[PDB]
Design a protein around this ligand. Sequence first.
Ligand code: ADP
Ligand code: ADP
Ligand code: CL
Ligand code: CL
Ligand code: CL
Ligand code: CL
Lengths: 496, 497, 499, 498
Amino acid sequence: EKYILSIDQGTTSSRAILFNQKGEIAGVAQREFKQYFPQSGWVEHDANEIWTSVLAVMTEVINENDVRADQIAGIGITNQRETTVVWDKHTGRPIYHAIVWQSRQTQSICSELKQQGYEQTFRDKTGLLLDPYFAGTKVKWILDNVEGAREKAENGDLLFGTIDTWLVWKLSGKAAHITDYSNASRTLMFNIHDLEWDDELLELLTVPKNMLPEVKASSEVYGKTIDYHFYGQEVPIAGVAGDQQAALFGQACFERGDVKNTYGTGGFMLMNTGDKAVKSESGLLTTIAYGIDGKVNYALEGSIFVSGSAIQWLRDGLRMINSAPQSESYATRVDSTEGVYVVPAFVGLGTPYWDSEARGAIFGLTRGTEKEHFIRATLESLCYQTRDVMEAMSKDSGIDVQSLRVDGGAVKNNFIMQFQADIVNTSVERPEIQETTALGAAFLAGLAVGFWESKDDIAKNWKLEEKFDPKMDEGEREKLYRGWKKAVEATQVFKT
Amino acid sequence: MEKYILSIDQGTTSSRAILFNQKGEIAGVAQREFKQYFPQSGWVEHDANEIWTSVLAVMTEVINENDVRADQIAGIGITNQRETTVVWDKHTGRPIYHAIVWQSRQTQSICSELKQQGYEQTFRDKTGLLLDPYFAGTKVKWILDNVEGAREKAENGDLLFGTIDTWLVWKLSGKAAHITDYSNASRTLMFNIHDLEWDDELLELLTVPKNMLPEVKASSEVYGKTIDYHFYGQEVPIAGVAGDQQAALFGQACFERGDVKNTYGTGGFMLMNTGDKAVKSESGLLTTIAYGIDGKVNYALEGSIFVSGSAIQWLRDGLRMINSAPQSESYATRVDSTEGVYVVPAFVGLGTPYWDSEARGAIFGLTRGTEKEHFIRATLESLCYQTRDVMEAMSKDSGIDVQSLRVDGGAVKNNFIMQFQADIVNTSVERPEIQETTALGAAFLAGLAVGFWESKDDIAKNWKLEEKFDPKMDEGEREKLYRGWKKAVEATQVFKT
Amino acid sequence: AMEKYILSIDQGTTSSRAILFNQKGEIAGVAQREFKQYFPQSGWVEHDANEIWTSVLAVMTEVINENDVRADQIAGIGITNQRETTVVWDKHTGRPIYHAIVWQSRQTQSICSELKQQGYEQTFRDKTGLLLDPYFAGTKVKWILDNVEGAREKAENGDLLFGTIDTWLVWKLSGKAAHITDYSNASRTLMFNIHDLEWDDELLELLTVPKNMLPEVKASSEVYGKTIDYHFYGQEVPIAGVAGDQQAALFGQACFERGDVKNTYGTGGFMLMNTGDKAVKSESGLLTTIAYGIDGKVNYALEGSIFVSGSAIQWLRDGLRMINSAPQSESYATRVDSTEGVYVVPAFVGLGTPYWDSEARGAIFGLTRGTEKEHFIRATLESLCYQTRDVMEAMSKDSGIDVQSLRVDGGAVKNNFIMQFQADIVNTSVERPEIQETTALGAAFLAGLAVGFWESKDDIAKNWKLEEKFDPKMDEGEREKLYRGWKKAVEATQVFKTE
Amino acid sequence: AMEKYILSIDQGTTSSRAILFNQKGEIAGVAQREFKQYFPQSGWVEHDANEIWTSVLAVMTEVINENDVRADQIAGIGITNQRETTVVWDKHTGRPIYHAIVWQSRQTQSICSELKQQGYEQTFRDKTGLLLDPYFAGTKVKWILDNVEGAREKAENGDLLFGTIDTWLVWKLSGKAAHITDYSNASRTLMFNIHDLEWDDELLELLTVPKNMLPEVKASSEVYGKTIDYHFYGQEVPIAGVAGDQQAALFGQACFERGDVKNTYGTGGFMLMNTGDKAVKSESGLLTTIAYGIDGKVNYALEGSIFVSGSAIQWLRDGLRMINSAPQSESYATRVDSTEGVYVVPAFVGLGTPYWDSEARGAIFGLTRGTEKEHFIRATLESLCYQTRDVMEAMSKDSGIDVQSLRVDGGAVKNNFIMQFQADIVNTSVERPEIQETTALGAAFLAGLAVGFWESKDDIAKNWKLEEKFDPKMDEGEREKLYRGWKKAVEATQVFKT
Ligand SMILES: Nc1ncnc2c1ncn2[C@@H]1O[C@H](COP(=O)(O)OP(=O)(O)O)[C@@H](O)[C@H]1O
Ligand SMILES: Nc1ncnc2c1ncn2[C@@H]1O[C@H](COP(=O)(O)OP(=O)(O)O)[C@@H](O)[C@H]1O
Ligand SMILES: [Cl-]
Ligand SMILES: [Cl-]
Ligand SMILES: [Cl-]
Ligand SMILES: [Cl-]
């Protein structure tokens, strides 16, 4: 009996999942790694700790689930997008921390180009915009701030790569330095319209072309694992794609109209737009969904920087709760937040505001406000934000979603699901297997090595765990939303 | 068997009773809290009956547990939370509704009504206040309008209005006296601080009969004696009433003009004795009576802050984030800065100098790296930023420049706050050895009345410095922080449903 | 708005309470207040008498002012209280010469030992129906007279007055007009002869306590006097009821006839059984004391005492700061199916019925690494029950009667888990009344019946209504298994005794 | 430059640790990773053999990366471990057939009672230098073979292998090349005759354990083989050191001959004394076991065993959720002048030296209404000290020697209160080392010397640096009173049994 090992290197933890022929989870292993906040707005990881974590979950899932390494037909790698890494080709070590997709430490770089009118250029080519959110400015940051980098890059001693690249490069023993369309399209360097590194964007980002990896399809055998990194086995690595794109795939969203929403560190709703890249006029991102079978699908994306990450904050920042699940208890202990709103713009505001300078704020507080209200308010933010992007997309698409499929870590919190159904007046469908990112990447690989004959097995296996129906008249609905919007304005007013 | 003067400070969240010996020292202290009711957002109400029983409790407590008999009490001094209104049936002797607290924003509409009819300017020239839900007047009309049967009764002479002083003195004297003093009267919005009498016009606008009103009196004067049964068989003279903040002013020796002090309690209040000439303000400060004594009446400029220490108390009761108020200093000093975070505790709107009833509490500058220590520190700092706002507004209206400010109140104990205050305002902060000046002020008003003390001077010659905090930060860092503060406030006023 | 009410004051070990009662026997208002519990040394337990007075004075002011009831509508006052707690004060100044020594205190131990070693324990039993334990007032008095500087000089000049809480309250509240007590309270002083119904001159000499400090014993339902005006809002309301808190509970439970039994779960756990009017002698560790004095008659009863019951749950809260509130313990207990070998013996101040071991202290057993916080709390909650059973079997012998359904009351009866477990571990039905504060209800009637606010005591029975009956629900094997472990815990607990 | 290192793995009862030692004997890196503890039924303690492996494999990876050191810079590997803890796996699939039974578990009580009732206890004492307590490996294997379905018949077909953690780790790490154990670890199995040095046939039949499952007993400092490339980043580094954690700590403290005594405060408390090559029989509840095999020599030792020491604080944390971290405990304890009569006897898994009572369980005494966290927690911390004194005196009488300055180490030795009270309660100075992770240091040297990284063991004696000494500051009066009470608390504890 064979299996497909999937690695989901997320923003706050790494995960290894085994899938049997039937598309069931044969095992799961998870390890968190440190998050660094050196200065307000900044967010960084330690590339070496990420590697060792991914290397850890693998070893774990194999041992704890009684399955040989020689039973892995293939490996799929899906990851936190944009997070940049720059290492020494030879010593194989990062020359500096990985600047996470959330970090605002490249703001000035953006402001420079933005002030030179180049934003429009980046929008027309990358389908993105000039926000510190994307890989491009992070490389430039490293080459301009990290001593020696500039000259090491000129001597062809350095390599760039988003997490997908970083992992595959290490796992294959430096055999392959590649990335797929989806990941590449989130770098501000890749021209998503002609599908190739844009020379102009590179010069404009003062980034050498020798550091870039080869851009390949999302379901292809990029190589094999080196024996010592996989228990003496050379297992093929045949799947790569950004976590959210892989989730899209995992939800069986293969053509126009298909929309899904993921609640992880951040909140991300993507819609498959087929092979016709669609331009957004409401603050959505135009990006590549995935490359498979000679085709290249595009998609519209709505990005929320902080979603579940706001609960983690309640836990690690304010030490107000011990675990994410505990939050629900408080939230369900009060009829409402009684006027209190929480805008988690910890790293600016994404779709549709796109405000890098905005920071987390809280409003409507009164002597009577207590934990229950405060925590509940935080939980509700994941919903108010989803609506923000949901309506923004409903207008750039014209399509009107009526039953959204969800997934991610936070989707198991029932209050969040019901309140989401209510606040949007739409049904929310939660799957039996909520780890769709993992599942998605597993298929990109399984299909590439013939573990599965067709992607449709995914649509067929999808099982609804529970649907959530709206239970809140307009009266209250729009009142609450009306207030959220005011809360978001006020947030934007606070800037120094 | 030496005697003592009993002071009662009926504050916003607790009642206190304090004994004082000839030497002006504390012979004993008793405190006791009472429920704060928040029926709706912005609303604040107390149970007038629970306030009475609490006052009655602390008294019993302070004498029984300090080996001091009731017969050794030369006089009683009563100072209190201002504006809090109580409307009760003269006959039954019990309130017809919770006392509406000074912080309450439930009389908002009423204040708007009058504004839209263009009366605000009238109230300013007469009361020296303005049309904010902060003052008594509107709270009375509110009751008369919203409490079933309230009017039928109010117009039969069956009801009596009263701010806490009037309520306490009336009950304690066994219904013998239904009086108030100038200081308390000036905060009702129905008293003309220039004519020193109730204003018949203001009363008609607030649709408040003149029969419910108590008679204004001096601050130091024997208003009557406590009925035996509410004071252990004795008939002790009640000879001292005055708003809690004014009392603090008097207990700080701020007698002459230009004298300024700041109290850090549930709220933050900065009064400046303007002598005997009510100075007009154009920076958001109030004009009100300091005290009535020696046949004279002093005026003063006030800077008011609805939520100060109350914010720290919220970290405890609300977010159940700290065990005790003083436990906050622990966290604050654990991290070097707030790192961008600010806290604007407009739980019940903003006072001096913004005066925004609609405003609410908000927090800014948050990031994933924001830890619990930063959040609490930003709260402790807000008491200071707020004090600065008030201080600059007064520096203008008075033209005077404070080089060293005297302080008092429950929160002064916290050294972090005291130092940060001195830094952010760039002025020396002086903390007295006996910080409960409010209770000590009421002591002397009573004492001086019953001739327990010769002169008020004693307060000055007996006052002693506990510690003086002096500024210790650069100019750049100063304005940078204050710049963000104002931004925070600015943003906070934008959020209005 | 012109009905009258009866004010009941229950001055308990950890809190004071004031409760109003209408003609219909319903609660017209309730006011509670706590007071500091002093523990100067291990086993010592003391209150500040002054603080008790001011607390009683507080709940009164509170109950009338916040229930819209004037003082002039109070037909009478009932005063029931924590027993044994001794107070010694100067008649003149009117204030105590030392903290009140609570009934739990073990600071008078040596004194009890001395008397035992002189072979007097049998004497006190035949006379008081008690025994030489630091639990009763007598020894506490001598303790003060012996250890408080100048105590003797003054005690022998008539300058001092002894009194258990009832005496202290009535004296202060009556403005020094009455220095009395009733039979129920008196029988717990160790100086009162429960057979001759009078102070025993011999017992007093042994305790070296002058007869001039003693108050005069009276019936339980009788107008002892009127409250002085200034301590009751200008009114002179009659004080017409006094009786030990537990007895009151017995009366309020309608346990008037012989064979009647009830159990109270408060600071301690007390099981009284009205033995009619014939003091039954015990040989299983139960006490013999006066139930009440009413209608010209005097009833007796057998008592099973437990020093620490709900006080153990209160210890989880104040001591180990392990739970937020008492009722928050049920949450944990029901979270785990069993204690998994763990047992808690709360002999904080020794063991009462049926062990009577002053030297014993609290102990916990059956611990393992797997022992979680839930199990620990559950083990504490369960001890209230085990202890109840120990007392129950001892009484089943001394009376030969078999309880098939026990009535209960007290602060802890609210906790369902404890109720069910009691019903199970004892294998008997437990009945929880709708009005669980029977102790104050009892004091109410003693007063009311005196001042003629009610015709007969029968009303207490006709008006009593069941809230819920708990019925046994576990096998025989499991029952005894648990109880066998309990006794083992107890057995070991008595083995730990330092010098 | 071209600098080498010695990787040391310390597989402890509650966590696995990897430590790098440079030529100078300094720590070049540390990595720790806790693993789950299972308490299926009261008294039972078990670990998941696989999770243990994946943890050790984890700490290795971490220490190497985080500390920027190449795998090819490792001169050698040393493995030290939690003793007695048993593991039984399939020779072929390399999978344990059931959880590892931890040294603490009491789940083999009935087995002990059987043999104990048949008079065989004296047999085991005379041969193993131990006794019939569920604390040792022997009964655990039998438990597995008798209770785990299929085990019996798999063992008869030679499909199963036995091994204490050291063996398990070396067998996995070396790719099944080596299935060995050293003297120290072996001498804690109830199967190894410590007097003639070999698996005792009688004891084996008597434990119904096949001889084909037993590994080879080798010296404590010898190259047992190499790591397979895939379990060590493509490198085949030599595995040249094995020894029970406590023995390794003895060696680490520079206790090489008679008189040398140390005490470790980890999950459990263990004091060992080197008795040279003459195995000394104990008459006061101590254990006679092998210290280590090195240079053709095989030193013996006297050991005092306390099942629960630091493990009692962890309990306050995980069990009662009374504190958030072990270190926090001190805060409370230092906040009161005494426990005011409260005692805590953490017999969570029976009592060891010198009481040896498998039935005993944790108990608490001296409680009153005035007892509060500070007193409760402080009492717990003090138990670590009282228990040490129990064995200290028990050893001072079997040895005749009188210790007057004990060297200490372990996870709980960084808690000053515990060190000062210990000095006080015993009336002896307590010396705390700079490097308190001596177990790792010791194992590292067994390896390092085996591969020639170091020429002699004396380097250990010379590098030892005293971090802080603690002197007694408590008159007999109070001293003897407190201990007197402790003893009573222990008696009372033994009374509670069902
Ligand atoms: N029960 C829960 N309730 C609320 N939030 C949760 C819950 N479980 C996990 N989360 C949140 O989900 C996030 C982790 O989800 P995941 O999709 O694994 O992250 P990522 O997208 O970074 O891979 C965390 O930020 C966590 O706070
Ligand atoms: N819900 C509850 N669960 C368990 N114990 C309780 C609960 N409520 C109150 N208790 C306990 O009951 C006791 C209260 O005693 P009470 O019956 O009021 O009279 P007294 O104070 O005279 O003993 C306290 O010790 C308290 O811990
Ligand atoms: Cl809501
Ligand atoms: Cl700051
Ligand atoms: Cl149980
Ligand atoms: Cl001690």
